[PDB]
Write a protein that binds this DNA or RNA. Structure first.
Lengths: 56, 61
DNA sequence: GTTGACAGTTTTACGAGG
DNA sequence: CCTCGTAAAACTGTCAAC
C-alpha cells in the first residue's frame, strides 16, 4: 500500500520503456503528488526496473 | 554536474571489446567508437579511466 | 508469491595535482 | 590522458513482513 501511487508510477514507467529513469525534477513532482518520500520513489523505481523490465 | 545516466548493455559491449584489446584508446578510435555508440568523445575517454581502476581493484588476494 | 526497504558494492562524471 | 580521490545517481543481495 497505497494503491493509486503504484498506479501512477506504473503509468510513467510503461510510458517510457526507452528511458526508464526519472529526472530528479520529475521525481520531486512524483513525490509532490504521491504521499511518498523522494527516497521511496527512487527505491521503487530501482526495484521496478529489476522487478519488471528485464524480461521485456 | 551531469546526472547519473548509465549505459545500455550493448554500449558496454562495444567497450570491453576495445579495452580487452588495448587498455588505452587512440584519438581515432576515441572517435570511431563514439559515433556508433552515440557517446560523447569526452565520456568514452572517462570510461577507460574508471575501467582501468577496476582492473587494479580485481588485484587480489 | 511479491512488495517495500536497506547496507554494502558497483557504475557514471568532475576536479585537484603532478 | 592520468592515477587518485571525491561527490551522487543507480545496482546487487538478502530479509523479515504485513
Amino acid at each position: 500500500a497505497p494503491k493509486v501511487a503504484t498506479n501512477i508510477m506504473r503509468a510513467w514507467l510503461f510510458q517510457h520503456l526507452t528511458h526508464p529513469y526519472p529526472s530528479e525534477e520529475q521525481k520531486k513532482q512524483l513525490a509532490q503528488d504521491t504521499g511518498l518520500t523522494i527516497l521511496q520513489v527512487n527505491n521503487w523505481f530501482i526495484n521496478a526496473r529489476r522487478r519488471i523490465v528485464q524480461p521485456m | 554536474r551531469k546526472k547519473r545516466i548509465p549505459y545500455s548493455k550493448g554500449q558496454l559491449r562495444e567497450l570491453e571489446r576495445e579495452y580487452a584489446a588495448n587498455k588505452f584508446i587512440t584519438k581515432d578510435k576515441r572517435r570511431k567508437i563514439s559515433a556508433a555508440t552515440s557517446l560523447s568523445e569526452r565520456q568514452i575517454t572517462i570510461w577507460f579511466q574508471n575501467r582501468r581502476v577496476k582492473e587494479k581493484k580485481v588485484l587480489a588476494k
